[PDB]
Each structure stands twice: as structure tokens, then as C-alpha cells.
Amino acid sequence: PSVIVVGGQWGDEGKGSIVAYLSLHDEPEIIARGGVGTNAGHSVVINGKKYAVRQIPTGFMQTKARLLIGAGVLVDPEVFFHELEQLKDFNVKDRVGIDYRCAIIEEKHKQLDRTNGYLHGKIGTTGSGCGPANADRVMRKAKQAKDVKELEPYLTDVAQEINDALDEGSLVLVEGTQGFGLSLYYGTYPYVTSKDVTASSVAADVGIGPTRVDEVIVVFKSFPTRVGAGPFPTEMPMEEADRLGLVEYGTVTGRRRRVGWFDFEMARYSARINGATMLAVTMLDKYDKEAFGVTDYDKLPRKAKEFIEEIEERVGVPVGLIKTGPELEHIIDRRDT
Amino acid sequence: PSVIVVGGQWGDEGKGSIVAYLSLHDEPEIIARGGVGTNAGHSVVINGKKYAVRQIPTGFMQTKARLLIGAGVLVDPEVFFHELEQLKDFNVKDRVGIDYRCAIIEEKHKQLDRTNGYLHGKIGTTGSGCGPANADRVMRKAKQAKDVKELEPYLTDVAQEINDALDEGSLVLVEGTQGFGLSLYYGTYPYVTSKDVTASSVAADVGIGPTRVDEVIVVFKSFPTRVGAGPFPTEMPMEEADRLGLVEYGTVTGRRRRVGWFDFEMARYSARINGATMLAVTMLDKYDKEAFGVTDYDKLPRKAKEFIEEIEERVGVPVGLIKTGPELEHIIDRRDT
Numbered sequence A, B: 001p002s003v004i005v006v007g008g009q010w011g012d013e014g015k016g017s018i019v020a021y022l023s024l025h026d027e028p029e030i031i032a033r034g035g036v037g038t039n040a041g042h043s044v045v046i047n048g049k050k051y052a053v054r055q056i057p058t059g060f061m062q063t064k065a066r067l068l069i070g071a072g073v074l075v076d077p078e079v080f081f082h083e084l085e086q087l088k089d090f091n092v093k094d095r096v097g098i099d100y101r102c103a104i105i106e107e108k109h110k111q112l113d114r115t116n117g118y119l120h121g122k123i124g125t126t127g128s129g130c131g132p133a134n135a136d137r138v139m140r141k142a143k144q145a146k147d148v149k150e151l152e153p154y155l156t157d158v159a160q161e162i163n164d165a166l167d168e169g170s171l172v173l174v175e176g177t178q179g180f181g182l183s184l185y186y187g188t189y190p191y192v193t194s195k196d197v198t199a200s201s202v203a204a205d206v207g208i209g210p211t212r213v214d215e216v217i218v219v220f221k222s223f224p225t226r227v228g229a230g231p232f233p234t235e236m237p238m239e240e241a242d243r244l245g246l247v248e249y250g251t252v253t254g255r256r257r258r259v260g261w262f263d264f265e266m267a268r269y270s271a272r273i274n275g276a277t278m279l280a281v282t283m284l285d286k287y288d289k290e291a292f293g294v295t296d297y298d299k300l301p302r303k304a305k306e307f308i309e310e311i312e313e314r315v316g317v318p319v320g321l322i323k324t325g326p327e328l329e330h331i332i333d334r335r336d337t
């Protein structure tokens, strides 16, 4: 089958941790990244050890899953190589593949992203250079992965590989970056990322026609977060975030998250435009601590269950995945309901 | 259901003429149009009168239908108002709706697109300003349709309208621009347009999840064409294009189209990444003159049928629409197979 994982809020909803579980649990042949580039920080906890990737998909754990990066994604050579080293224990380097049509993040781009009054001060961007690079790509002057000789051993056709796999019945897992709220089209412009992030865009990033997409999982966290500036309707004061212990720092910039309550009307909208078939809710332990570690649905505390059900009815999409903690095992899998 | 129409070559495959037929024939409630923007020239012949639109979707013909422009599309106010005027007898002004999140083409964009040595001289672009506009949008500096007061009476939520329609069971027809060969990701970079053009991107442009897309029509012409520079594998000398009477001029720029022989390998690739369910072939009358006007498959000349069948086997997708001339009636509809 086909599964696409996207964010339903402003990113950082726990997409990495979910692609993580699905990789190990469902054993996909191919696990691919779509999204923008390296502006994303996806974290996963593996038996007490927290990892964080930006370029390589969050599934390296699967020593038997081909790891791919779609043509629509930006590639930062420095970051890609650092993560080859950072994940050597998983033999990532032998299982990885960069589409030869990917655009390249150069140091001129990182610079611009890090210095300019508008992207750095006002928006304010990540500094990954993803913004200015796509601008160069739109202007068709940026270079492609084909033109970087240090990347030649890893060059491939991700679009072909993925489609070739789908023909033989193999399972393909696709990872998107950010969340619906950061969509260049449907997000809170101009406080967004440099590209649409919805499931349709992610499919185009890896090279999959919309008809070939079987499942679309949209990830939500119990308390939505925003890094950087921009409107946040259900935003809470920072004093409350502490009290409820909702303090988190960026995985790339290291800046505080801005925390808020679950926006249901936004959730319904985000889920529907994505064409969500299944919802996934994370950090339920942060909504109610008594739900920590729980792996069966009906052993959830009651205050936790009325949250999942309130979501399921005000969004109109079943929740088939509930994460109850940082660890892999901290997950409820209601794929049979 | 849902049908998305996209190009399989380098644009100008007759997408307009096909969205045309489908609008009148199948009577869709909505007829959104994706693509990049106004850089597209879509022509249709209505009972001897040839029309050409850039902003308003082909399908204005259908007076019962709602005409929409997805948020992912660029909007040129001048062109939009000119085409409201160019098409009054169809009363487009009342049935049209622009997504309030569309980015705006300003004259600063147009000038740079027409003058700059790289975009104008090497590529060379259309001059619609779609390139620089998207660059300004990626940089999140562009204006949105909400911010243009002259556009307020036509502002709407295309994503909502389309999805609301798909819930009532209504038919939604979606029009894309260009062709696969001009895709920013998978086309002939840098000789491409400023955005991915495949069906998944087109779906994201209007606000439709990949799971909500029922049918994907990829349009091919008997002899592929290229406007502007860039690689063209099966390109013929211009002497042969006149010899075969294959001379066509740009709908927008009036530039003469480079002509070539049917590229079968590029068609299978283009069709497959698009996730094509159905093929549509136009200008069969240009491949064999004896096929002109034929509206039934049974009566096509032999040389005509071995072309359609050679396509069907070397591309691996059934051809359910065969256009045999400029007029609406000049069509073979094998959608029942």
C-alpha cells in the first residue's frame, strides 16, 4: 500500500516519531522523505536514546528499508554527510538514495536566510537556507544534485524506484515536513515555509500520482506549537506552558516553542484539505499524565478518551494512532477500528 | 467523482479543448484550474469561434458551472478582468471565484520576466511574470488576492467549495497548466516552468487531498511541441513541420512551436509519475488526415488506430479520449472501456 504522513498544525507534531513506529512495525520496503529540505527537525527516541534528523528520513532504524529523498526536496550536502556519520550505526549510507533532480542548498542561501531583516527578523525563518534556495530553484538558476560530484554515489531516480515498488505490491512510507499551518498556500502567509506541505504536495515531491496514494495520516499533538512569528488563535501565555510542563526547544534553531490549546476548527480544516484517511495524535501524556505509557485504548484514563473522541467527532476522521510518550513502545495502534 | 487534466509533454497538448468537451459533456458542478498562472494559453473552438484563456478555466462554456481558481495559482488582475470582458456572453463574472490566498502578479514581475537576460534570453520564459512572482511568493513577499480590493467581489475559498462539492457527490473537474516536460522537479531543468505541474501538484493547487482524486487524465498530442529553448529528443527540422503542416504559434507569445515526433519513452514516464488512469490524445487528424472529424473509433483509418494502440501498449495506459479536430464534436469518447 501507500502511506503519507503530514503535519496538521504548525509542524513539530511528532511526525518523525510516527514514521519511526510505522517503519519498525509495518516493515516498509521504501521509506522516503518529501517536504521542503533541512529546515525540518524530526526527533525520535530509540530505547532511551533521542535522535534528530533533518535530511535522512526518520526510519533509518529499519536496516532493511531503502531510504530515499524525493526530487522536490532540497538537499544540503553538509547536513546529508553529517547525518551519514551521525547514523553510521544503522548503515544508512548503503541504503540511502538522493534523487538526481533535487535542488542544492548552497552557502550563499544559508547566509541570506540567516542575515536578512525580513526572513530572519520578521518571519522569522530557520536559517537552513531552504527559503532562498527554492527562490533560486523557482528562478531556475539553482544547481541540482546531479551537478554535485560528491553526491554521485547516492544519485538515483526516487520517482521510478517508488513506483517500481508500488507495482510489486511493496509498502512505501512517505514522510512530509512541517504542518498544514505552515503551507505556503493554505497556511498563515507570510508566516509560513517556502512551499505547500499538504499531502498532495508531498506526493508530488517523491513522484507519486494522487491515485497511487492509499493512506494519508495527519499528525496532531495535544497542544499545538509554533516556532517563530505568526498568528496563533489558541496560543497560551508562556507561564502556563511551564506549569503544565509543555516546554520544548527547536531541534535546529533551539528556540522555544510557543504553546497553545488544541484548535479543533483548524484541525477539521487541516485534515480535510489533506484528504486525511487516518488521524494520529501525539503527546496525550502531556494532556493527561495518567495516560503515560498506555498501549491499549480502553485502559486510557477517561479524560484522555474524551479528548480522542472529541477530536474524532469535531474533525470527522478516525484516530488510528495514539502516542503516549517519547519511546517507540508508547503507542496505541487502533488500525483495526 | 473527481477528474484532473494534465499535460504529458511540454504543454500545448490540447488540455483546454479536452476540459472543454468534458465540461459540456459530463456537466460538472465545479471546474477549478491549477497550474502556475497566466503563462498558460488554453484554446478552444466553439462552433467555429476559437477562444483563448489564461486565467479563467476552459469550461466557461458551461453556464451551469462554478468557475474556480485554486490558491496555488498566480493571479494577474489585468488579465483576469480582460478575460471577464473577453467572455461576457457566458456571464463568467457572476460564476467565477478566486481563492483569497492566491498570489498576485504585479507589473514589476512582468517587466523582469520580459527583460532579464537569463529568463527571457536563455530559457526563454513567457513574460507573464509567473517566474518572478513565484520567487516573490517563495520569499513570502508577494501580495495575496485578499489584499487586492479590486478582487474582493470574487474572493472565495476554493478548497472549501471543491471539498464541499465532493461530499455532495458532485463532479469536480480540475484543469492544470503546461506538461510534464516543463515540471520544475521532473522536467528538463532549467528549461522548465516555475513549479511542478504533475497531477499531485495540481491537486494541491486547488485544495484536494490525493485520496480524493478519482481520475487523472494526461493529455498528449500526436506531435509534441516546445515553445522556447531546451532539450527535445525527437525534434524534427522546421522544414518537416511545414511539410506536415504542423505549424502552430504560441497562444500567449505568438512564438512558433518547435515540433517533434511522438516520444514514447517520455510518455510512459510522464504518464506513470502523474499516476494516469486515462490517456487523451489530440490532433490525430494531424497524424493522418483521413481521421479528421471521426467521432467513432470503429471508423478510424488503420494508420490512425495503430498509433493509438502503439501508444496504449508502449505507455501502458488506455486512451479514453481521442480528439480528431479543433471543434468540440471532433472527439472519440471511449471512456466506457
Ligand SMILES: Nc1nc2c(ncn2[C@@H]2O[C@H](COP(=O)(O)OP(=O)(O)OP(=O)(O)O)[C@@H](O)[C@H]2O)c(=O)[nH]1
Pocket: A007, A011, A012, A013, A014, A015, A016, A017, A040, A041, A042, A043, A044, A045, A177, A178, A179, A251, A282, A283, A284, A285, A286, A323, A324, A325, A326, A330
Ligand atoms: N512526551 C511525549 N513526547 C513525544 C511524544 N511523541 C513524540 N514526542 C517527542 O516530541 C518531540 C517533538 O517532535 P519533533 O522533534 O518536532 O518531530 P517532528 O514532528 O517530525 O518535527 P517537524 O519535522 O518539524 O515536523 C520529539 O522530540 C519527540 O521525541 C509523546 O507521545 N509524548
Ligand SMILES: Nc1nc2c(ncn2[C@@H]2O[C@H](COP(=O)(O)OP(=O)(O)OP(=O)(O)O)[C@@H](O)[C@H]2O)c(=O)[nH]1
Pocket: B007, B011, B012, B013, B014, B015, B016, B017, B040, B041, B042, B043, B044, B045, B050, B177, B178, B179, B251, B282, B283, B284, B285, B286, B323, B324, B325, B326, B330
Ligand atoms: N487540428 C486539431 N487541432 C486541435 C485539436 N485539439 C486541439 N487543437 C487545437 O490545438 C491548439 C493547441 O492547444 P493550446 O492552445 O496550446 O491549448 P493547451 O494544450 O491547453 O495549452 P497549454 O495551456 O499551454 O497547456 C488549440 O488552439 C486547439 O484549438 C485536434 O484534435 N485537431
Ligand SMILES: O=c1[nH]cnc2c1ncn2[C@@H]1O[C@H](COP(=O)(O)O)[C@@H](O)[C@H]1O
Pocket: A010, A011, A012, A036, A039, A040, A041, A123, A124, A125, A126, A127, A128, A129, A130, A131, A177, A178, A182, A191, A192, A193, A194, A227, A228, A229
Ligand atoms: O520543521 C519545522 N518545525 C516547525 N516550524 C518550522 C519547521 N521548519 C520551518 N518552520 C517554520 O517555517 C518558517 C520559515 O522556515 P523556512 O522558510 O523553512 O526556513 C518559520 O516560521 C519557521 O519556524
Ligand SMILES: O=c1[nH]cnc2c1ncn2[C@@H]1O[C@H](COP(=O)(O)O)[C@@H](O)[C@H]1O
Pocket: B010, B011, B012, B036, B039, B040, B041, B123, B124, B125, B126, B127, B128, B129, B130, B131, B177, B178, B182, B191, B192, B193, B194, B226, B227, B228, B229
Ligand atoms: O502553456 C504553455 N505552453 C507551452 N510552454 C509553456 C507554457 N507556459 C510556459 N511555457 C514554457 O515554460 C518556460 C518558462 O515559462 P514561465 O512559466 O512563464 O516562466 C518556457 O520554456 C515556456 O515556453
Ligand SMILES: O=CN(O)CC(=O)O
Pocket: A012, A039, A040, A041, A042, A126, A227, A249, A250, A251, A252, A253, A254, A255
Ligand atoms: O523543527 C524545527 N524547529 O522546531 C525549529 C528549530 O529547530 O529551531
Ligand SMILES: O=CN(O)CC(=O)O
Pocket: B012, B039, B040, B041, B042, B126, B227, B249, B250, B251, B252, B253, B254, B255
Ligand atoms: O501556450 C502558450 N504558449 O504556447 C507560449 C506563447 O504563447 O508564446
Ligand SMILES: [Mg+2]
Pocket: A011, A012, A040, A041, A042, A043, A251
Ligand atoms: Mg521539528
Ligand SMILES: [Mg+2]
Pocket: B011, B012, B040, B041, B042, B043, B251
Ligand atoms: Mg497553450
